[PDB]
Structure formats: C-alpha cells, structure tokens
C-alpha cells in the first residue's frame, strides 16, 4: 500500500525531447550544495559533466573545487590533490556505517541511479522531496523520522532537505522549493542516464531509416512474390 | 528435392514476369475488403476469450482495491 | 529514365558502383539533416 506519484509533464518525457541541459546545470548545483552531504553519486565523475552542461575547462574548475587525497605516496600513506577531471564525485561518510551513524542508521542511497532504481523515479523523487506533509492521526513514527506520504511506509529517515530558498541558483532563477525539486529530479535523471539525449537522436535516425526502408523492402518482397500471387492454376483432365 | 516431391497430372499453371505486373495491384482496392472479410471469419473465435480476460483483469483490480478498503467497522 | 537503367543499372558492377557512391553521400545528408531536425526539435534544450 503506497501512494503512487502522479505523472508530471516532464520536458524530457517527449519521444524526441532531450534533457533540458540547462536545468540540469541548476539541478547539480542543488546536489553539490545540499544532497552531497549525505548521498553519494558514486558513478558520476566530474569528467562526465563535460559536454552536457559544463565545458572542459569549466569542469576543470569544479573538479579542483574539491580535494581528493590518494593513499599511494612514496613514503606517505596519502597525498591530497584537488580533484581532477577524472576524479569521481566525492562521497561523504566513507563507510556506510559513518552514514548510518549520523543518519539514524539509514543509509542515504546513492542517488546515482536513484531515478532508475525507484519505480516511477523522476516522479517519486519529486514527490518525496515535496511530499513532506503533516503526519496524520494515530501515526507514531520512531525517533528521528519524518512524514512523507510516498516513501515506502511513509517513514523516511531523511529529513526534509529542501526549504524554499535553501540554496541560490547561480542562474538566478527563483530558488523555490519546487524549482529546486524539479531541477534535482532532472539532474538525478541525467545522472541515471547520461546518454538520454544521444540515444533519442539515434532513435530519430532509426525511425527515419525504418520509414524509408520498410516500404522499399515490402515492395521488393511483393515484386518477387507477385509472380506466384498471380499464378493461375487450371485443372485439365484429359 | 525438387523433381521427386510429388506426382500431379494435367495441372497447367500460368504466370507473369514480375516487371510486367504492377507492384500492388488493387492493393487497397481489394485488400481492405479482404482484410475485412478475413476479420469477420475469425473474430468470433478469437475475441471473446480476450474480452473476458479484460473483464477478469478489471474485476481483479477493483476487487483487490475493495479488499484493501478499510472495513467501516474496523477499529471502531 | 532509360538512361539510368542503360547506364547505371545495366552493368551489375555499375549497379553496385552507384549504390556505393550513394552510400558514401547518403550518410552526410541524412546525418546532417537528422541532426538539424533533431536540433530544431530540441531547439532550446541542449548544451550550447
């Protein structure tokens, strides 16, 4: 028994509608400033951004923004290097336990494939992040819990992370809770499928090529098969 | 193989060259009537099982929902 | 046109030759065309 998030008219939903790629930019900013404290986008590395919403040199900037220490050192057991383009996004709470420790024993699931891993993810995400409504009568959530009608059980350890004007969009687009939930749902979506745009272009070329090739192959088949389909049989007993 | 497949007699068989015949002669001219002719001869054998599958599927869904519905008398 | 058949299709090799050349050029056009169509389709939502 769970609330089933409604269908939102997500822009990228269109058959050939690519991800905004402008919105995503905003969404990430949302992940970097809010969601990165607990969740880990393990499978998305700074380099990944280049080509989607940040240019090579631009990405280099962000990469350097954070610091990454690698153990291998000549004598030391580590060396700290500002993140390089190749470095993957920095996961907090190195061990999950760390996370559990501080998150009431609730592991913030990596939001790398969250949209793909959650049924109706894009919607779910939006709903969950925006579904932090009032608990009803009779409900008795355990210590360190909150009420969201969508989350399985309606008892998500995660406290509501998006308060209107939680962060300021560099683009200046008003940072309303929603504008922020929609941006982070687009971004998480992108994260779970960086190729969304490239694919849809392949699908458009595939539809054009099949629309060219199916009637022509049908015409070749009907040529070769016309011979028989016109064959007239006659029985002429002597 | 061919030549030893079967024995027929006095069955003449005329035919035409592909390039000498139109590609889709009377295609939609008779195709539609025929497709419709065909659908009639098979619709009563095919369709009513899938119709009652649709009724059973809907029924199951609705029944399940009602099942999930809270007894008014529950906890009162 | 008979010319086409007489010159391009009559010789099987030419039949292939024309196909070959056509293929060499089809990609260019189709790619660019579809690309732009796609670009227009998603005119505003892209990296740019």
């Amino acid at each position: 028994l769970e609330l089933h998030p409604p269908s939102y008219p997500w822009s990228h939903r269109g058959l050939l509608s690519s991800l905004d790629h402008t919105s995503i930019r905003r969404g990430f900013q949302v992940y970097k400033q809010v969601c990165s404290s607990c969740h880990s986008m393990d499978y998305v590395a700074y380099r990944h951004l280049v080509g989607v919403c940040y240019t090579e040199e631009e990405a280099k900037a962000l990469a350097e923004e954070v610091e990454v220490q690698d153990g291998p050192n000549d004598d030391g057991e580590m060396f700290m290097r500002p993140g390089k383009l190749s470095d993957y996004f920095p996961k907090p709470y190195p061990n999950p336990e760390a996370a559990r420790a501080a998150n009431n024993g609730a592991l913030p699931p990596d939001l790398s494939y969250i949209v793909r891993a959650r049924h109706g993810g894009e919607d779910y995400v939006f709903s969950l992040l925006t579904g932090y409504c009032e608990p009803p009568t009779g409900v008795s959530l355990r210590e360190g819990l909150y009420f969201n009608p969508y989350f399985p059980g309606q008892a998500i350890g995660m406290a509501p992370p998006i308060y209107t004007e939680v962060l300021e969009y560099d683009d200046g687009t008003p940072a309303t809770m929603s504008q922020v939930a929609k941006d982070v749902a687009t971004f998480l979506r992108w994260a779970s499928e960086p190729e969304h745009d490239h694919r849809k272009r392949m699908g458009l070329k595939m539809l054009l090529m099949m629309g060219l090739l199916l009637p022509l192959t049908y015409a070749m088949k009907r040529h070769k098969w016309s011979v028989l389909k016109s064959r007239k049989l006659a029985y002429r007993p002597p | 193989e061919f030549g030893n497949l079967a024995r027929i007699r006095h069955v003449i068989s005329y035919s035409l060259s592909p390039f000498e015949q139109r590609a889709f002669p009377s295609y939609f001219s008779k195709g539609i009537p025929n497709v419709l002719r065909r659908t009639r001869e098979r619709i009563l054998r095919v369709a009513p099982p899938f119709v009652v599958v649709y009724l059973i599927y809907t029924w199951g869904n609705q029944e399940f929902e009602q099942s999930k519905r809270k007894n008014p008398a529950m906890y009162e | 046109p008979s010319r086409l058949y007489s010159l391009l299709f009559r010789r099987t090799s030419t039949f292939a030759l024309t196909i070959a050349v056509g293929a060499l050029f089809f990609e260019r056009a189709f790619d660019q065309g579809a690309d732009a169509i796609y670009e227009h389709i998603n005119e505003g939502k892209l990296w740019k």
């Binding site: 006659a234 | 035409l16 390039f19 015949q21 002669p25 | -």
Partner: peptide, 24 residues
C-alpha cells in the same frame, strides 16, 4: 487439347514494350 484455352486474362494484374522495358 492445348488449344482449348488461352492464357487467362492477367490484365487486372498487368501493368500499364522495350521502350518501356528499361523504364519498368
């Protein structure tokens, strides 16, 4: 015998001749 009948009329199927041979 053979002459009893003529090739059935394929006109319905026949399209609308070397002049047209290449064309076809």
């Amino acid at each position: 015998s053979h002459t009893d009948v003529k090739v059935p009329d394929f006109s319905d199927y026949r399209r609308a001749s070397k002049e047209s041979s290449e064309a076809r």
